[PDB]
Design an enzyme around this catalytic site. Structure first.
Site, PDB file in Angstrom:
ATOM      1  N   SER A  50      11.649  35.510  46.317  1.00 36.97           N
ATOM      2  CA  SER A  50      12.808  36.248  46.140  1.00 36.97           C
ATOM      3  C   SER A  50      12.984  36.678  47.618  1.00 36.97           C
ATOM      4  CB  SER A  50      12.665  37.559  45.371  1.00 36.97           C
ATOM      5  N   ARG A  51      14.178  36.369  48.160  1.00 41.61           N
ATOM      6  CA  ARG A  51      14.554  36.494  49.544  1.00 41.61           C
ATOM      7  C   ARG A  51      15.154  37.824  49.919  1.00 41.61           C
ATOM      8  N   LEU A  52      15.234  38.759  48.904  1.00 42.35           N
ATOM      9  CA  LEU A  52      15.761  40.080  49.183  1.00 42.35           C
ATOM     10  C   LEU A  52      14.732  41.063  48.771  1.00 42.35           C
TER      11      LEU A  52
END
Lengths: 45, 51, 593, 457, 593, 129, 129
Positions: free
Chosen positions: F121-123
């Site tokens: 998950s990039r956030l």
């Protein structure tokens, strides 16, 4: 089952990995058996 | 040195046979299976459009 | 009436229509061919005529029946072979002087030549009645009533008159029900449309075993009554073999066998085979067949029949399910049903979905598996019933990623894989733990534990022996068995024995084909005791070759165990398996030291 | 009226709505030629027709029609034995005029009084490779699956010449009771291939007991699809009237499928997967239904269609549909041919669904089936163990495994190798199997009961 | 005639067609571009126009030629270069002063200013005549009368007018046939549709014995006439070299060379080189060219002309077959012919099929091969002629899995491999017994067995020696030479000889350039003779090393046979071999002792 | 979704909507456009399938009042098993990362069988503290 | 190409024609069609992609009089390093050999990085003197 949409690219590189291994490993094998033969005649004597 | 050489060549010999027979044809057959489905998705679309 | 505008292929267009549903039944011409109105374009309704055609004049009358395609639900359907458009094949043999149906013909769906025995119910004069109430029963079997006659759903009222006990005809009226004046008079048979699932009071969670009769199925991943099963083909499946097993061994009250547009030889095998084999509780009137009603279709027999087959069969199942009878519904094969949709989508000219298979395949398929399950019976009395849907499917793509297989896999509860290499060796039906699951196993295993079996512990140990075997088998082929240790050498060997002995259920006996829940348990127990004792013995100092050599005779005896009948010892729990436990224990002492 | 247009093999006729479905019409060309056609589609004052003769050269107002008023039917007669036909029923080698004693329409459903009692008698060609592993019953259909680079033609030929010599021997055992006839339909094959088949029937003395229908690929694609069907209508007639077991050899299936495909991408229907028809299944199904015992229960139609994969796979749309409909397949492999094994029929995935049914005990042993189970298992494991031997050497090859290596060689060079005039019998096949199987210990031989094993090792 | 309604892309649609048939050749507009009627909808015809339509308008005339796309087969066919629709390239080079033919320029299909000296055949006024009967002949070669004037097929009658001997123009008439009034006048040239195959008395199994003068075809897997042969290409593996060889060395009457849609650099070579090259069976007057009729399309030439190409060449060969001459048909390459079909479909919006390649493909490839073959010639004398088909195929998707290569291998009974490696080593052709088969072989060798050669026995024994050797090489690699016996070493030597003598050629002498049946026979007789004695002698107490030192002179002599004349013993039976048998026997006495 | 938005906005609540099964939702979209003028794109899926997913996905995020939010968990079963199939491929793009369950863990006898290797998950980093 | 054929024929000059990028020309051809009743072939590229290539190819070869010539070197860029990509395959069949330039040598830092490993000229002997 393996991915349908553009697996082609990964699967091609798998082939290139395999291919490189046959040639190189056969050279390596060739050389070891060539030596092996030399030793054979020495050990026997 | 000889006895070792004798054991290692036996292992190196098995590996060449294994990559040649099993590995390479698996890569051919899998590639092919996916190719055949793949080309048909692109083609049928054009026929759908045309109809 | 209608006037036939166009005959283009099996799709026929007729003008000067009126009414027309979208599942309305029509008869085209004076020939009276089976059709259904698919679409309407303008005043003209487009009908696919699914019967064969080589001589249909354009500009003939088309007659509406005024109603959707339906099946008759009532007495005398049992022990009767029909097609999916409901014409007694047996009657067709007599009349036509031909076994299969000739085109240009149509005949009534139930024989109207016989009388049936009405026995009173539990609804006398002035009792209130509502659909699925058991109005009476007609005996059809020599131990049970297979047809308990219900008032049809969406009928209700108070009964002015119940006709007394006696024999009547099925055309004959025997009931008057009052709702809003004289509602109508009723007969023994009532209709119901196949595209409308029959109502139910409530659904119940499944909890009661489907005894599949087969070792490989009970042992690897069990099924439940109320279950849903998907089986993928490749013509090494052995579908007829396992279907024939399902009919005899499954302890369901009724079985509805459905031929979905098959070989025509295989459906003929299962019809002939039932009267030769015996019921699992005594009775003769053509034994197995007496509980079995068949829908039989062939591949280039009317496509309406093929298409209607799963719907007509499942509606048959639902009727008996509301009666409070347990039913095993075997669909063979739904992928030919799905194929029909591919064909339909093509003839019409509408665009398809993935690989030419339509998008409406997934939703239609999903409704179908959802009409099956375990339930509490419709009506006031309250009974419990079941429908267990078992459906075979096949590729036509030469992969397992194709739409038909995929859309079923999505929806299905129990999955019994197909491994082509094992089947090439012959191991009908063939499975590994990695290709199969039953989500139902957990709740089933607690139920089996009560029964006697050591079942939970054996389910975990079974998966584990196969799963380890698979990983090691790659290492052996490529690298060598040199890396492996003697315990893991054993893992392959015990697992091999399980392949040959379980999976193989083709046999030449009914002991090598029927393995009771108890027979399946003893076998699995005996084999695990071996594996555990075997890993220890090599561990405290013994070889894979040495161990193999000492058991020797005792190993052959467990292989050949399966051939032996189950009717001995206590029941199927033989003394033959019990003594064997002691001989393993003894062998263990020898092996180690 | 007259011809409005032609788009490919579809002809757009403008004519009235009075004809029936599959009603013959005749096109009068200004070239001094008449061509026949049959209505594929009827529409509001127009029809779309596929012509049996020609595929092109159709005009507008130079070309006129007269409708025959008669739907497409075959004059099926029983005195059609020994006569030679083409792919429409005209003589090409001056065989006897068709006549007529009954007319049946072609729809894959003449009178259709196919099976509701299954086959159970056994037919043997004397080929062990075929018979033992695939027990052919008297109305089962088992195709031959082969691929390019094989002599599929040669094997089809083995069946045809050796059948009609083995069958009277089988007559005494009560495997048979009645004469055999062969109905050969060739589709889309070369002159050279066509002559070969005819040569085989002459050579044996079964030219009078065979019907031969020859369609070549340079004859219309529409003529080619009618050719298997025409053969089948005739076949049902012989079965009905004179109560013979009719074997149908329908070669080649791929040629037939190529014809269907041109009439489905030139149709206003979109075809299925890989540009192969959406009702391709159906087209194939039409042949296949026409199998089993025919009324009077002593004639039958038995089917061996011949398929060559044009792309070397069982992935392809032709093998996959074919195999689902039929009841088994008999597989031929490339490796065996290359080596010098004839017939080169491999036994690795060849399978008979109705094996149990086909074996009996009043003309075959009951041990045919038990011993079959061993051969299929043993061969299958043995082939896989050999490939494995190559990789591993002798460091994961057992004593027991060495024995499987020997069984494999011997099976290949004896069981599968027999010349094209060598005739066996079922009892001999079992005996030779028993011997090969004999080196294995009692423990090893575990899928067959101790009663059987002990008597015959 | 017609009027143009619309022109959309390369496709022209034209209205006022009350008599355009769907195979008709038409000249569209005033530019007279070539076009042919694909489809007809109503009074509108669909024409694919193959030649650039920039300049073309709507409302312009459409003038029919009155016949389909056809080729004219007339005299003056030798020493000419044509297109595939047939128009002399050579006449355009002179006149237009441009090598290739540009848009809007057209010429008659053969030169028409040419006059020929016609001699009568065997007919006279008022005698009945039939198709294929020789009505006269024209010389074109000083070896043969290439153009026998035959009565046209689809023509028979009684002959009202026979012109005598004398010189006539092509336009000028010589025959009138009365057959329901005057049938028409006839001229030297006769017309024939490309896609329609000529009628023949009957076709027979390909078995007619003639060489191609290349030994390796004959020796390894008998070369066939009336055959069908596929060869894999890749456009720089030396396929083009063997095609020019195959054309020269042959002793067949004519060779027809078809460059289906090739580089154009390869077509340039065949124009020039063949007149430089000299006959192997004698004849002057531009030797190879005089025997050759050349159809040359490069890949850039109209898709119609390339598409027609294969049909047009085979038509010229079939006609000559009917004449009673043996013609060799050499086509490079059917992969380019297939590709062109893909182009046309795509331009129309006609759906293709598998791998993006037309549905039309299978049936077309098959239609073509069946035209080729041995036949007994059409007409009343009855003669034997043959047409041998050799087609190159190549990847069409960059794979050999292309529909084309795989479809043709099915149809053919001869497959002959071709390699880059053997071509770099200077073996041309490049056929090995692992990448080939010929099923025609049984009939051919049998034929040879009759004439004098011991051919069948010798040939089976040749295949086996090369096969067995491959296996013996694998041991040399792994173990080495310390596990091989004298007898296995001998197999290797014999195999090297077979390969050396047959497979390796390069035109070393005018003895490699042409080889008769007899020289091929003597070579293999010598190799087997040595094989049996040599192995026998090592069994009796000899060594490979011993055999080698003594054999010396006789063994080098058999290796060098290919440089020497075969005319040493007699005139085509070789003396260098006949003496060898005696010396080899003598050799063996010394060897054993 | 609309009801969740009302919960999140008017009364400042933390709303979790669990939306199962996206795959069933995707098919339904696909069955339509079989008589619409609108035409279907790649693999017979509508080209505005993305647009359909995005309408569902829109109600998700912190509401104004910044004391409520709606958190959304869509449930996707891959019907073909690959992640390059249209149903997952498009969704993964609209969302910020993905969570992979896998067959292989399930086989050994694991629960809940979660592979983490393609799962990212990039956030993730920024939110948390 | 037309300009070149005039310089080469009438005033006899040897002309080398450098044409970059054939991949962009091919795309244009695939791109046009959006109301035409003409359908493309594999990977969305025309069935008639052959025909279009040929068109450029027809102007290339010796001119009449033959001391002038038109010599053509077309430049084709593999976008994804696929030699089974339809553009190079069709071209490759028509062309008299091919020059392969690989990424590997550019990476060592050799410039130009033409690996002469699978490169070929089929009329290699024919050129020199």
């Amino acid at each position: 089952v393996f991915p349908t949409r553009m697996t082609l690219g990964l699967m091609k590189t798998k082939l290139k990995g395999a291919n490189q291994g046959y040639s190189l490993l056969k050279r390596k094998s060739e050389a070891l058996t060539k030596r092996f033969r030399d030793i054979t005649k020495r050990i026997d004597d | 040195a000889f006895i070792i050489l004798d054991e290692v060549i036996k292992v190196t010999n098995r590996r060449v046979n294994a990559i040649e027979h099993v590995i390479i044809p698996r890569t051919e057959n899998t590639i092919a299976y996916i190719n055949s489905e793949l080309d048909e998705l692109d083609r049928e679309e054009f026929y759908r459009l045309k109809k | 009436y209608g006037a036939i505008y166009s005959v283009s292929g099996p799709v026929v267009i007729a003008e000067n229509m009126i009414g027309c549903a979208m599942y309305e039944l029509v008869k085209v011409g004076h020939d009276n061919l089976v059709g259904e109105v698919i679409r309407i374009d303008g005043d003209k309704a487009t009908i696919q005529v699914y019967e064969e055609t080589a001589g249909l004049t354009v500009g003939d009358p088309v007659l509406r029946t005024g109603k959707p395609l339906s099946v008759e639900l009532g007495p005398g359907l049992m022990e009767t072979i029909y097609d999916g458009i409901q014409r007694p094949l047996k009657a067709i043999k007599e009349e036509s002087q031909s076994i299969y149906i000739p085109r240009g013909i149509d005949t009534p769906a139930l024989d109207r030549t016989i009388k049936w025995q009405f026995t009173p119910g539990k609804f006398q004069v002035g009792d209130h009645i509502s659909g699925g109430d058991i109005y009476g029963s007609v005996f059809e079997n020599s131990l049970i009533s297979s047809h308990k006659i219900l008032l049809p759903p969406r009928s209700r009222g108070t009964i002015t008159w119940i006709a007394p006990a006696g024999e009547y005809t099925l055309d004959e009226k025997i009931l008057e029900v009052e709702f809003d004046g004289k509602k109508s008079d009723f007969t023994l048979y009532h209709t119901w449309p196949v595209r409308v699932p029959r109502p139910v009071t409530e659904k119940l969670s499944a909890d009661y075993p489907l005894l599949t009769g087969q070792r490989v199925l009970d042992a690897l991943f069990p099924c439940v009554q109320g279950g849903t099963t998907c089986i993928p083909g490749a013509f090494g499946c052995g579908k007829t073999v396992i279907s024939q097993s399902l009919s005899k061994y499954s302890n369901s009250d009724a079985i509805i066998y459905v031929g979905c547009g098959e070989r025509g030889n295989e459906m003929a095998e299962v019809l002939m085979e039932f009267p030769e084999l015996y019921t699992e509780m005594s009775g003769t009137k053509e034994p197995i067949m007496k509980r079995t009603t068949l829908v039989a279709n062939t591949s280039n027999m009317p496509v309406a029949a093929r298409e209607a087959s799963i719907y007509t069969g499942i509606t048959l199942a639902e009727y008996f399910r509301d009666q409070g009878k347990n039913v095993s519904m075997i669909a063979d094969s739904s992928s030919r049903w799905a194929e029909a949709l591919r064909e339909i989508s093509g003839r019409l000219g509408e665009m398809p979905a993935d690989q030419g298979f339509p998008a409406y395949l997934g939703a239609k398929l999903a409704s179908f598996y959802e009409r099956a399950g375990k339930a509490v019976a419709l009506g006031s009395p309250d009974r419990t019933g079941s429908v267990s849907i078992v459906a075979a499917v096949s590729p036509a793509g030469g992969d397992f990623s194709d739409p038909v297989t995929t859309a079923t896999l999505g929806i299905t509860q129990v999955f019994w894989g197909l491994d082509k290499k094992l089947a090439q060796r012959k191991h009908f039906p063939s499975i590994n733990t990695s290709v199969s699951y039953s989500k139902y196993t957990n709740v089933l295993n607690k139920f089996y534990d009560s029964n006697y079996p050591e079942f939970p512990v054996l389910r975990d140990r079974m998966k584990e022996i196969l799963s380890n075997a698979e990983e090691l088998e790659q290492v052996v082929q490529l690298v060598g068995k040199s890396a492996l240790s003697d315990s893991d050498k054993i893992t392959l060997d015990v697992a091999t024995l399980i392949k040959e002995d379980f999976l193989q259920q083709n046999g030449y006996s009914t002991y090598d084909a029927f393995c009771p829940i108890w027979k399946t348990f003893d076998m699995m127990r005996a084999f695990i005791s071996y594996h555990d004792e075997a890993q220890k013995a090599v561990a405290n100092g013994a070889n894979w070759s040495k161990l193999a050599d000492s058991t020797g005779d005792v190993k052959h005896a467990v292989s050949s165990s399966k051939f032996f009948e189950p009717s001995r010892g206590e029941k199927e729990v033989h003394g033959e398996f019990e003594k064997l436990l002691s001989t393993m224990q003894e062998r263990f002492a020898e092996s180690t030291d | 009226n007259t011809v409005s247009g032609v788009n490919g093999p579809l002809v757009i006729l403008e004519k009235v709505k009075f004809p029936r479905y599959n009603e013959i019409v005749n096109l009068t060309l200004p070239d001094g030629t008449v061509r026949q056609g049959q209505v594929l589609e009827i529409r509001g004052d127009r029809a779309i027709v596929q012509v049996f003769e020609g595929t092109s050269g159709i005009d507008v107002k130079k070309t006129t029609v007269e409708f025959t008023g008669e739907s497409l039917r075959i004059p099926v007669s029983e005195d059609m034995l020994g006569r030679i036909f083409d792919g429409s029923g005209r003589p090409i080698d001056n065989g006897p005029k068709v006549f007529a004693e009954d007319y049946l329409d072609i729809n894959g459903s003449p009178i259709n009084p196919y099976a509701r009692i299954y086959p159970e008698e056994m037919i043997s060609t004397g080929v062990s490779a075929i018979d033992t592993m695939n027990s052919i019953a008297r109305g089962q259909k088992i195709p031959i699956f082969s691929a390019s680079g094989l002599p599929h033609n040669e094997i089809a030929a083995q069946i045809c010449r050796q059948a009609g010599l083995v069958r009277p021997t089988k007559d005494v055992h009560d495997g048979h009771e009645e004469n055999f006839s062969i109905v050969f339909a060739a589709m889309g094959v070369n002159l050279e291939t066509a002559r070969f088949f005819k040569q085989d029937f002459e050579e044996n003395g079964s030219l009078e007991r065979t019907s031969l229908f020859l369609n070549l690929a340079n004859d219309p694609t529409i003529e080619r699809i009618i050719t298997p069907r025409l053969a089948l209508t005739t076949a049902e007639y012989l079965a009905y009237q004179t109560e013979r077991h009719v074997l149908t050899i329908l070669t080649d299936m791929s040629s037939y499928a190529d014809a269907l495909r041109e009439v489905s991408a030139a149709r206003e229907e979109v075809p299925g997967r890989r540009g192969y028809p959406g009702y391709m299944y159906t087209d194939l199904s039409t042949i296949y239904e026409r199998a089993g015992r025919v009324e009077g229960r002593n004639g039958s139609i038995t089917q061996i269609p011949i398929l060559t994969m044009p792309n070397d796979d069982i992935t392809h749309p032709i093998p996959d549909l074919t195999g689902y409909i039929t009841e088994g397949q008999i597989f031929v492999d490339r490796q065996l041919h290359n080596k010098g094994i004839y017939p080169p029929i491999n036994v690795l995935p060849s399978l008979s669904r109705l094996m149990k049914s086909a074996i009996g005990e009043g003309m075959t042993r009951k041990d045919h089936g038990d011993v079959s189970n061993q051969l299929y298992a043993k061969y299958a494991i043995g082939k896989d163990a050999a490939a494995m031997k190559a990789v591993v050497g002798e460091e994961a090859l057992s004593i027991e495994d060495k024995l499987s290596l020997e069984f494999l060689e011997k099976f290949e060079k004896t069981f599968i190798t027999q010349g094209a005039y060598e005739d066996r019998t079922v009892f001999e096949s079992l005996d030779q199997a028993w011997s090969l199987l004999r080196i294995y210990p009692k423990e090893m031989l575990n899928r067959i009961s101790p009663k059987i094993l002990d008597e015959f090792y």
